[PDB]
Amino acid sequence: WLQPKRYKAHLMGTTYVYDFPELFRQASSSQWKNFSADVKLTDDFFISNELIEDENGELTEVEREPGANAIGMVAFKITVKTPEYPRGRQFVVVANDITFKIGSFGPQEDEFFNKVTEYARKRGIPRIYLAANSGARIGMAEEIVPLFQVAWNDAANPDKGFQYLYLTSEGMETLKKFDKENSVLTERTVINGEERFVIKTIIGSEDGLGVECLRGSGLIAGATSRAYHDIFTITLVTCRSVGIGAYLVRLGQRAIQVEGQPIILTGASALNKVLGREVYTSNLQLGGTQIMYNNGVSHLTAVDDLAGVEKIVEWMSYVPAKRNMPVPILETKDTWDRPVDFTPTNDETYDVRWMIEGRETESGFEYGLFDKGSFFETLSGWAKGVVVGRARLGGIPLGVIGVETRTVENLIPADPANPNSAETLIQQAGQVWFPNSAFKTAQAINDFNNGEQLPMMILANWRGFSGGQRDMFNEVLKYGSFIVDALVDYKQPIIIYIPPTGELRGGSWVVVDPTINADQMEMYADVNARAGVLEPEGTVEIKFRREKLLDTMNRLDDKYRELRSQLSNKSLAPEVHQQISKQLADRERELLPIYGQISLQFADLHDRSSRMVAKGVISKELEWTEARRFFFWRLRRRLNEEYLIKRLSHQVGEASRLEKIARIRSWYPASVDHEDDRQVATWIEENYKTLDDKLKGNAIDGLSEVIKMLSTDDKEKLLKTLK
Amino acid sequence: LRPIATPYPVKEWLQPKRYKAHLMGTTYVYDFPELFRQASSSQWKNFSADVKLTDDFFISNELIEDENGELTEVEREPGANAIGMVAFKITVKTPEYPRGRQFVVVANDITFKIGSFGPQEDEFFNKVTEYARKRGIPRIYLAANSGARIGMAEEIVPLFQVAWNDAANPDKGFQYLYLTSEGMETLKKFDKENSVLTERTVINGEERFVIKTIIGSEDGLGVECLRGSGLIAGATSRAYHDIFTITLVTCRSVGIGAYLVRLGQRAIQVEGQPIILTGASALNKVLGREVYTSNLQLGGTQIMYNNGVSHLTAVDDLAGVEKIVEWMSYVPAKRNMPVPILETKDTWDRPVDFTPTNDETYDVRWMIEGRETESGFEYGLFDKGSFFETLSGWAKGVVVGRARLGGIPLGVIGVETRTVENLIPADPANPNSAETLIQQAGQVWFPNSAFKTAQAINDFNNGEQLPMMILANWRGFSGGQRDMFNEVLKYGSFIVDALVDYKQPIIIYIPPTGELRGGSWVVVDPTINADQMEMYADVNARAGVLEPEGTVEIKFRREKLLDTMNRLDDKYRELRKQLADRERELLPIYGQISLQFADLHDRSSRMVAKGVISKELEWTEARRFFFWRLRRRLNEEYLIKRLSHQVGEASRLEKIARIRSWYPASVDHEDDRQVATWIEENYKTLDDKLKGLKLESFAQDLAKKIRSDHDNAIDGLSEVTDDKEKLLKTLKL
Ligand SMILES: CC(C)(C)n1cc2c(n1)C(=O)CC1(CCN(C(=O)c3ccc4n[nH]cc4c3)CC1)O2
Ligand SMILES: CC(C)(C)n1cc2c(n1)C(=O)CC1(CCN(C(=O)c3ccc4n[nH]cc4c3)CC1)O2
């Protein structure tokens, strides 16, 4: 029954739509096996029910035989009991049916997709889209093809040309007969004693020919744009994804691309016709993984459909069950109560990931800041200068942004359409934001914020932005501002931590300071961190110049001081004066290097975490080895306090964030140190139910209008009040 | 005096700071309002040369913080600024606001500590920004700075000692820096104990106070300045959404200063004044070679104007001030006020003269503003001389600017049909790099033109609060390898996002010779923002999934073409050898027939029939049509906004249905002129009737609250001077 349609899809290198929930069931089971191999699953752990529009065109869960779809767009509401949600979590799966009219988007497919998107959106549940299509549906008025006539310039010579296309009374009568007179817009003329119905416009009786499909593209593009802000959106490019299909992948932002499946706008063949040469060899050349994964359009790659489904399910494990719910806490064997083992040094080169997830070493595993094996890196193929991913801190999921200290290189391919173009390698220095790494940073902030609704840790380590001509021309200023904007829009706790060996300077600090979003942001610097406007060399150039360098010499070098003192003798011969002056300038020459080194140390001494603390720009200075223990309780307390704020907001609401926490903090016992993270979180957790109870406890003219209608006895009272 | 014998006082001698500013190639802060007064007067002269102005037309009042740090107006001598950041609240009677309009001017003082940003400057800038934001008035920033303020603990400089490896040889090195008991006592004496963090050590029976951290007693040395940068960056980011923001790069703008230029989005750069993050000299020290020759090489107009970071260029400070004043003339006096209607000699009631042809090359601008021609001026869609193009140096494939349609200001996006070229400079740091010319075909969205489109939509929406017309004419996006690799997909999606966020009427008009296809229609369909968007297609426009040639390739292949030859050719039909020879003969003409057939589907009439466009239009009548449509839309929009005051929350489809019902029987809802006229003729009547309803419901509510819980409410009624006086009069009658 489904055997033919199944092969038809496999032939196209994709899974048949109705076979996808099975892959989700497999991925969900694997998820369990990796979490606790000793957990035995029942069929009630995973449930998939198709979504079909009812009598009133409203989407509803159903139990129906697969492949009975009257349209090329299908949907499922999945309910899974997962390690993070053992009682269950739900999401929606929208997918094109590649077997139904080549996976094209017609008005019906567009309306359904939109309805499904709104369904997920209304319920706050994630929307998963499986892209396997050929873009907007193309058509012509087939009923007109055997009917249309040609008004020849000379009927004896067709090469002399034609004036217009028309219908005869016969052709017009054939359309009337079949109830199709609205298929064309004609204009009656008489030529050679015959009614000629000049075709002014061809409309077609059949729907889904052109513009109507395009209106649908627009509708679904705007709907996706909207959904990205509202719920968790992800796309699996399971087969080719063309035109509107390509836009849907980017519009849902988060994308996993199956190796060998292209994300294209226009096919290689068409591009060759427009170019008038065989320029492009394939669609993969235009939109394969080597294009999209390198761009950052595709966040991850997959070997097959199951691999992709597994990566969706893994990504979702960091995402709340639905909008506004708390982030899914999933504690594992690597608990919070341990020091951080891997510590960077300025003398040995390191991979940030060792600091994040830890490092396998000959003498055993060196634990990092986050939970062993909790780091799920995304956008791994693009702007490799920044390291972005999801991690867990003692069970708490969060977004992580780290800085790649190593020089990063990337190949820009040769433009097939330009024979006077060659491939290009670009090298970018570590600890510097470039247009790409700045864009990725802003992108990461946004993706963690929207739908994922995650807290975030930026392990801040940037010298600044690349200020040179190339990068300035490639709009580094634009991409850096995105970071500020992304930070302003943030809605969950943010932690900015300058790690050991880390730094932040004038250009990099501007975009990460907590004052950007005081509601969510906090900054911390490691004891082995550095921050100042400029790097020591730059600061001495401005603030410890020659005059200062010569004063320090007079104070410190005996030889310099003595020679300067010899120049106080008002009895000197000019020649002798020139001699002492010469010896002094020769001592300055001799001392300039080391006194320059002294100045660098003096500048560096201002750039410390202790000055940052003293100046009130950071919350606390920290020791890397204790950062895990510290941050775990800080994040935990922040999330609890954030919950109570959200609760207080949904009752009163008419107060500032500052006013809302001050009230909440006033409910804590007097002996509770508000600066003690572990104590606060513990008290809150021990008292959620108790707190919930605590929580559960122009006009002057209208005022004149009613006051007048009141009784005499009442008016007498309010008269006394006015008096 | 320098010079002596001048007829009038030497302004540069009376205030030496003025000469310092000039010596840096910028205008003295305190002389900027004078330039605003000149620009405002020129504005009047160009509008109506026969208008006599009095000095009361322009007023500038310096804003300084009071005892409580609240911004207050002052009249004081220039150069009295105790901080390097100065502000003015300007009040001008302008052609668009003849009774007056107000804005705020924030500027760095380049003479005060080299225009650096210290915590005080940052706090003032933020306060000023909040001042403008609270009042809904525009915020103009004049950038002339050296970024964040750099400092060291000057009190430590004459005190610090060096622990030498060998005191006899300084080149052998040093261990650390320290203080003596004497230096420690010196700090205590001056109440500066907190300047350093020391650690007491005894080296050879001598007390050494090892310097562990230098803090400094003086504020504005490092990180505190950086916290200020962050605060002002976020404040600007916020203001861009709230009020009209613009920046004039009047002298160099460094670090945080460069970020402020971009963060306020709209920027005018004075030729020869750089927008830089790091100076060329420093970059040369970091690189270890003389790579860069100047700061202009990094952030001059040839970099920023070409980038789209700088929206416009200026020859001098006045030119820049003139361009600010011109740009503001399309912006409401303050947030949420109606767009400033400024009717000129070119009224709405006229046909459009310049019409493009399918066979001949044209500049979109001729369609927009009109064209000077040998036989006289050919009027365009908008008001003669009303087109103010911005971002003119970047992504020249799209034409963006402000215009007026019969006095109504709006944002305009047009498509450059000509091939556009741009020079990508050679990277000075890479000797294996050369300059590159890139050519981009007309009527196609590329990463740059897509970015500019989205940028334009955003800039018209935020602060400017303008309606917008997109003269939609795109084949699609460049889907080829280079552009796909250069993330065209990302930049195109920005357009969708930008459209979603739009808050004023949008008109999508496919003009004559215009087109929209599968790839380009996706990002401009009205369903993206049904609340604001409408689409129209000219009678000579085209729209379909693919271009005719693409559609025949899929839907009118050989078999169909030969069946067509069989029907429409006696010779071919009779033959059903010689048949293949007739196919050969007919192929070129039947290809034209198949293409015409295909094209016949791509018409405005099919768009109308399919319900994808509001109306199909004739270009020559588009001005007359759009004027009244926009006018009618703005009047309805205002009444929807006015209804967002009425007792109870309602959808916009509810609000429009309500407003529309009120229209008298004689008012044709399809007549844009009648509907706009009715709204305007009855605004006072509507406002009155509406007020009487917010009151009537308030009156009903209080009687409800009172006719149950009497005594308890009468006490609260009692609980709730000038107001008491009114209520007393009411009770007395
Ligand atoms: C070249 C590359 C490594 C990409 N890079 C590396 C950068 C940048 N570019 C930049 O465009 C920014 C930056 C920030 C940090 N820097 C300073 O603080 C600085 C200032 C003044 C100085 N004078 N002498 C030495 C100095 C150092 C150097 C420039 O780092
Ligand atoms: C000029 C250039 C930049 C190369 N360009 C010009 C473009 C693109 N690129 C594109 O990547 C997209 C596009 C869109 C409009 N097009 C069609 O609708 C179309 C489809 C199929 C076809 N088959 N034969 C001829 C055909 C035409 C052509 C390709 O325009």
3-state DSSP assignment of residue A226 = helix
Q: Per 3-state DSSP, what percentage of chain B is helix, strand, and coil (rounded to 5)?
A: 45, 20, 40
- Where is the binding site, in residues of B? 148-150, 252, 519, 555, 557
The verdict on a CB contact (< 8 Å) between A149 and B568 is yes
Q: Which ligand has the nearest atom to the CA of A136?
A: 2
Instruction: Considering only the beta carbons, identify the residue of A217, A280, A598 that sits closest to B521.
Output: A217
Residue B468 phi, psi (nearest 5)? -145, 145
Those residues whose C-beta lies under 8 Å from the C-beta of residue B696, and which sit 6 or more positions away, are none
Distance between CA B84 and CA A497 in Å, rounded?
32
CA dihedral A459, A464, A469, A474 (to 10 degrees): 40
Instruction: Give the C-alpha separation, A497 to A519, whole Å.
Output: 17
Integer Cα distance of B510 and B616 in angstroms: 9
Query: Apex CA A345: angle with CA A341 and CA A347, to 5°?
Result: 145
Q: Within 13 Å and on the Cβ side, how many CA atoms surround B116? A: 16
In this structure, which amino acid lies at residue A164?
Y
Beta strands in B174-304 (DSSP E): 174-179, 196-203, 206-214, 245-249, 253-254, 267-270, 275-276
Q: Does the beta-carbon distance from A543 to B261 stay under 8 Å?
A: no
What sign has the CA pseudo-torsion B23, B24, B29, B35? positive
Q: Are A45 and A87 in contact (CB under 8 A)?
A: no
Q: Distances from the Cα of A638 to the Cαs of A455, A492, A632, B296, B672, in angstroms?
A: 10, 9, 10, 46, 55
Whole-angstrom distance, CA of residue B256 vs CA of residue B279: 13
Q: What domains can you pick out in chain A, each with its CATH number?
A: 1-138+208-323 (3.90.226.10), 142-207 (2.40.460.10), 324-701 (3.90.226.10)
Show me where chain B is broken: residue before each gap, C-N > 2.5 A.
Answer: 576, 720
Q: H/E/C letters for each residue in B174-196?
A: EEEEEECHHHHHHHHHCCCHHHE
**CA–CA distance, A612 with B232 (Å, rounded to integer):** 19
Q: How far, CA to CA in Å, does A610 sit from each of A131, A526, A602, A634?
A: 53, 10, 15, 20
Measuring CA to CA, how many Å separate B4 from each of A55, A500, B15?
95, 63, 16
Q: Report the distance separating Cα B595 and Cα A405, nearest Å.
A: 58
State residue B439 phi and psi, 5-degree precision: -110, 135
Which among A537, A543, A545, A600 is the best mutation to test ligand 1's pocket, defined by most ligand atoms within 8 Å of the CB? A537
* Cα–Cα distance for residue pair B476/A490, rounded to 1 Å: 34
Closest C-alpha residue for ligand 2 atom 9 = B478
E runs forming strands in B462-511: 468-470, 476-477, 506-510
Angle, alpha carbons B597-B602-B605 (nearest 5°):
110
Query: E strand or H helix at B224, and its extent?
Result: helix B223-242
- What residue numbers of B does the annotated binding site for acetyl-CoA cover? 148-150, 519
Alpha carbon distance B261, B274 (integer Å): 11
Residue with tokens 């052609």: B95
Please judge whether B610 and A465 are an interchain contact, meaning their C-beta atoms are less than 8 angstroms apart. no
Backbone angles phi, psi at A526, to 5 degrees: -70, 155
Give the C-alpha distances (Å, rounded to integers) separating A617 from A614, A621, B153, B231, B555: 8, 10, 18, 11, 67
Question: Does residue B549 sit in helix, strand or coil?
Answer: helix
Give the nearest partner residue to B522 out of A137, A214, A415, using CB atoms: A214
Resolution (A): 2.9
The rounded distance, in Å, linking the Cα atoms of A577 and A42 is 100
Q: How far is the CA of B475 from the centre of ligand 2 (A)?
A: 7
Q: How far apart are CA B481 and CA B485, in angstroms?
A: 6
Residues 6+ apart with CB under 8 A from B636: B656, B659, B660, B675, B679
CA distances from A483 to A226, A299, A434, A489 (A): 21, 19, 12, 10
Radius of gyration of chain B measured on its C-alpha atoms: 34
Distance CA A253, CA A235 (A): 8
**Chain B contacts of A615, Cβ < 8 Å?**
215, 222-224, 227
Look at residue A291 and give its three-state secondary structure.
Answer: helix
Cα–Cα dist B179/B159, whole Å:
7
DSSP lists the bridge partners of residue A399 as A390, A456
**Number of neighbours of residue B49 by Cβ within 10 angstroms:** 7
CA B283–ligand 1 middle distance (angstroms): 6
**Residue type for position A377:** E
Let me know: does B444 contact B476? Beta carbons within 8 Å: yes
Q: How many helices (H) and strands (E) does chain A have?
A: 26, 29
| Residue type present at position B327 | W
CA distances from A622 to A353, A460, A497, A512, B212 (A): 20, 14, 9, 18, 16
Which helix (H) or strand (E) is A30 found in, with range?
helix A20-35
In terms of CA atoms, which chain B residue is nearest residue A147?
B567
**Nearest alpha carbon to residue A35 among A322, A396, A407, A330:** A330
| Pairwise CA distance, residues B111 & A460, whole Å | 34
Between CA A78 and CA A50 the distance in angstroms is 9
- Tally of CB atoms within 10 A around A165: 22
CA A141/CA A150 separation, integer angstroms: 17
Q: How far apart are CA A561 and CA A584, in angstroms?
A: 9
Tell me the longest C-alpha to C-alpha distance in chain A. 130
For chain A, give the residues followed by a break (C–N over 2.5 Å): 697
Half-sphere exposure of A47 (CA within 13 A, CB side): 13
CB A558 within 8 Å of CB A512: no
**CA-to-CA distance for A358 and A367, rounded, in angstroms?**
4
Residues of B with Cβ-Cβ distance to A475 under 8 angstroms: 307-309
Alpha helices in A338-467 (DSSP H): 352-356, 435-449
User: Which residues make beta-bridge pairs with B62?
Assistant: B74, B88
Q: For residue B270, how far is the Cα from the chain centroid?
A: 18
**Cis ω before B447 (30° cut-off from 0):** no
The DSSP bridge pattern shows strands A162-167 and A194-202 to be antiparallel
* B646, amino acid identity: Q
Three-state DSSP at A478 gives: helix
Residue B427 phi, psi (nearest 5): -70, 110
Q: Report the alpha-carbon distance of residue B664 to residue B332 in Å, rounded.
A: 31
Which ligand is closest to the CA of B439, given by its number? 2
What lies within 8 Å, CB to CB, of B511 at 6+ separation is: B356, B367, B471, B472, B473, B538, B541, B619, B622
B430, B493, B553: residue with CB nearest A247: B493
From A598, A616, A717, residue closest to B162, measured CB to CB: A598
- Decide: helix, strand or coil at residue B107: strand
In whole angstroms, what is the distance from residue B650 CA to residue B658 CA? 10
- Helix, strand, coil tally for chain A in percent (to 5): 45, 20, 35
Contact B24, B110 (CB under 8 A): yes
Q: How far is CA A176 from CA A142, A167, A173, A179, A184, in A?
A: 15, 12, 5, 5, 11
Contact B616, B536 (CB under 8 A): yes
Query: At A26, which amino acid appears?
Result: Q
Going by the annotation, the residues of the binding site of A for CoA are 240, 543, 545
What's the CA gap between A456 and A434, in Å, rounded? Answer: 21
> Residue A620, exposed/middle/buried by CB under 10 A (0-12, 13-18, 19+)?
middle
Q: What was the elucidation method?
A: X-ray
Token pair 């540069």: residue = B12
Give the SS3 label for residue A430: coil
Locus of tokens 């300058």: A498
Q: Report the alpha-carbon distance of residue A623 to residue A167 in Å, rounded.
A: 86
- Three-state DSSP class for residue B219: coil
Query: What is d(CA A329, CA A2) in angstroms, rounded to the nearest whole number?
Result: 41
Q: Which residues on neighbouring strands pair with residue B613, listed in sequence order?
A: none
Report the distance separating Cα B336 and Cα B465, nearest Å. Answer: 8
**Rounded distance between C-alpha atoms, residue B159 and residue B689, angstroms:** 79
A67 lines ligand 1 (CB under 6 A): no
| In contact, B405 and B630? CB cutoff 8 Å | yes
**Interior/surface letters A588-610, b for 16+ CB within 10 angstroms, e for the rest:** bebbeebbebbbebbbbbbbbbb
| H-run or E-run covering B639 | helix B622-642
Residue B376: partners with Cβ closer than 8 Å, 6 or more residues away? none
Q: Is B2 in the pocket of ligand 1 (CB under 6 A)?
A: no
B64 Cα distance to chain centroid:
28
Spatial separation of the C-alpha atoms in residues B709 and A252, rounded to whole Å: 54
Burial B633-644 (b: 16+ CB within 10 A, else e): bbbbbebbeebe
B181-191: buried (b, 16+ CB within 10 Å) or exposed (e) per residue? eebbeebeeee
